[PDB]
Write a protein that binds this DNA or RNA. Sequence first.
RNA 1: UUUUU
RNA 2: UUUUUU
Lengths: 53, 381, 379
Amino acid sequence: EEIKAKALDLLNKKLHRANKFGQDQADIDSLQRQINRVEKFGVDLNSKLAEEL
Amino acid sequence: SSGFRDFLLKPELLRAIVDCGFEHPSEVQHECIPQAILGMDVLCQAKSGMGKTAVFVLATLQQLEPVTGQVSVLVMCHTRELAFQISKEYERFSKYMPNVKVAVFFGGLSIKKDEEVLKKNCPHIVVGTPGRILALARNKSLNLKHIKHFILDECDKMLEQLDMRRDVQEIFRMTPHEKQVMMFSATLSKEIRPVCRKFMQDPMEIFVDDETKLTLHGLQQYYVKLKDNEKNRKLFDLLDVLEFNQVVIFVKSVQRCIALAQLLVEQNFPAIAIHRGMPQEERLSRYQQFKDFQRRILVATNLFGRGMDIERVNIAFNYDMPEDSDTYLHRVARAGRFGTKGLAITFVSDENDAKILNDVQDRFEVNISELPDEIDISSYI
Amino acid sequence: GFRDFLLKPELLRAIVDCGFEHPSEVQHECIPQAILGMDVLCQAKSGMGKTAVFVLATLQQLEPVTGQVSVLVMCHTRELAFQISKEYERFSKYMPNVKVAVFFGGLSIKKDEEVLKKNCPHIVVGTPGRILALARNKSLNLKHIKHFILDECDKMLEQLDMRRDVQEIFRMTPHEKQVMMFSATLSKEIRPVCRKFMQDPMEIFVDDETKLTLHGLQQYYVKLKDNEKNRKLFDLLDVLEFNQVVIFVKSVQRCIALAQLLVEQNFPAIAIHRGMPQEERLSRYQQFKDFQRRILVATNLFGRGMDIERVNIAFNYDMPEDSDTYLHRVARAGRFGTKGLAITFVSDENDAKILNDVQDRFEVNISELPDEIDISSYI
RNA sequence: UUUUU
RNA sequence: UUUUUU
Ligand SMILES: Nc1ncnc2c1ncn2[C@@H]1O[C@H](COP(=O)(O)OP(=O)(O)O)[C@@H](O)[C@H]1O
Ligand SMILES: Nc1ncnc2c1ncn2[C@@H]1O[C@H](COP(=O)(O)OP(=O)(O)O)[C@@H](O)[C@H]1O
Ligand code: BEF
Ligand code: BEF
Ligand SMILES: [Mg+2]
Ligand SMILES: [Mg+2]
């Protein structure tokens, strides 16, 4: 769960910076779709989202 | 008190049922149990997930007189996991009968462990799959000449298969001719009633011949039309919006089962898979963690399509169309156990997919609405 | 107040076109004397319009002759020379018979000779190295120049190599000419060096250096080790609203690495430094001034002269080497008295000594950065 | 698709 | 160090 909360911190920054610096709207939705999925579930170590880890 | 008292069961059996939390029997239990404990042969068909297992578990335990070193009850089914489920169910109802011993036998695990169990600690009740059981009988490790009760669960599927039918016939021959025979299923094709009938003398017949009542009117069942490419993306969106505790997703092959499970994992869906070809110890560990609610998403072949009783499965997915309306009715039944509410979503890909879904819609007098974009959380749980 | 200067009506028309409503202090003091052809040694506050002083004064005196170059302007960086040339075009909007040209290294010299031979300008802006090369091979004729301008003159003459090149360029020019030099910093030691190029010039000095600070700038610092610099900057770039920032480092290698790391944190950062090809340098410089990008990482190449309107924050990721560099660097933001923000990373004790040297010399306060600040107070 | 090897 | 024809 220490991985879970700190995975949310990396996404809450990528999403924040995407908004702040005019990112494509597809990227905003893709990040948010991943954030809400990570909250509804855990962090799977074999997932491709584990690239950042 | 009231309810289960009508049967006059053994007190240690009734104390077990109390610890199970059951309050009143289902119609199949009220109708079938009192005759079953008399020794009668029974051919039983009843609504999916309505308590068929407890019927033959309670009746065999009621009639059972334990004889040390002697197997008196044989129960068989079509999948290894189902035999495992039935064995543990025997354990929970024999909780207050310490002398009763139960064992389960199936392939994928060393036969010497099964042999060592038989020759060192012989059970009174044996549950298992036709292959391993027949192997142990030919082995002479399993002495089947003391059998007083012969039980088949999911019997129509077990007897629609001639290679499995001949195996159960060869197993049936090595048992005494005077004994109880009981067969259970939610589906009983009019073709296969005689096939089960040849195994019994004057059986009680529980039939739901007019299939108006085979539907689970506590389930909302919808469908979506889409391409194969759109199947994955639609599945991803549905798993995101729909709230659930557990989900079972059914595919039509081992290849599809492995690929979808891997694809779900890479999208950060904590999905597990179960199918033949896994090491048996591994698919037992994966069956248990799903049953113990340690995994939310299960992708399975038709291996998981019958008999599996998972408490918290809220949604059933037909990622691939079921082969027939028989397989459809059992897979959807994996949600909404004992008449609770649940959800069933079916993917219609090609012509044959809509062909089958119109068959099941007609056969059961059921409505399958096209899936709306918003569903009440109160609706399906 | 620009009417009183007695400028040419086209020149006055250009002033109103770019929106100037009132001359600055340095424009009031120097322009009338510079119109008359007097030598001027000018020191003035950062970003308060020194460029307009020598652009307008030379454009006023210019009597274009088709075959010859009359005004030469030099500075220390290529991008500053580019900026000055576009500033001449801006104020030559209504003087169509005036031609300007920029020559600096990193681009083919044959193209510079091509523009000289085929369409010779009246005003040349350049950097001393390329100008010297064009003058030695005789493509550039310096025998007609009547105005000789040095911008950022102290930095241009404190470099002995660059001073030697400027001196050789000067000796190729007529004795009868106007020489003007501009900067925001004029040390006691460098003033005679500038004066040796001039004859009885008007001298504009700022000897009370407390009025060289821009009181419209909020100036803070954070004590940090080099390990902690990277993410303190990351969070500051997240928290602070801004239109544009410039992030200064102490070396080309650090400029490349920090910019690359910022992009991988998905900050759309760009970098300018020596070693970038000049086409990439110019195109990168142009888009930053075109408001195409918000985050610029730079060496001291961008540390003085650069005039980008919407730079609200200036970051000292690495401590500037001395107080002059700090003064010019921090002044890339808040141009012409507007409000900006200045943040300096202090790494070791020597950095603190440099910071203390700065606040003593300018009698300015650099307080520690508070945890949250108001957006209006620096915008 | 499932059922000893 | 940074910057300045090569
Ligand atoms: N009388 C009862 N009251 C409540 N729950 C019951 C009763 N009988 C059985 N159940 C539960 O219903 C679930 C499904 O029973 P199961 O025997 O697997 O259904 P079937 O074999 O008919 O598909 C099981 O978890 C079982 O514990
Ligand atoms: N009178 C004025 N009113 C408004 N802005 C001015 C005025 N004079 C100059 N500026 C602007 O100030 C900005 C910076 O001037 P600049 O000449 O680069 O300052 P310095 O060279 O003294 O550091 C330029 O964008 C210029 O247009
Ligand atoms: F018919 Be049940 F689900 F075994
Ligand atoms: F001194 Be100014 F910023 F050119
Ligand atoms: Mg069952
Ligand atoms: Mg300037």
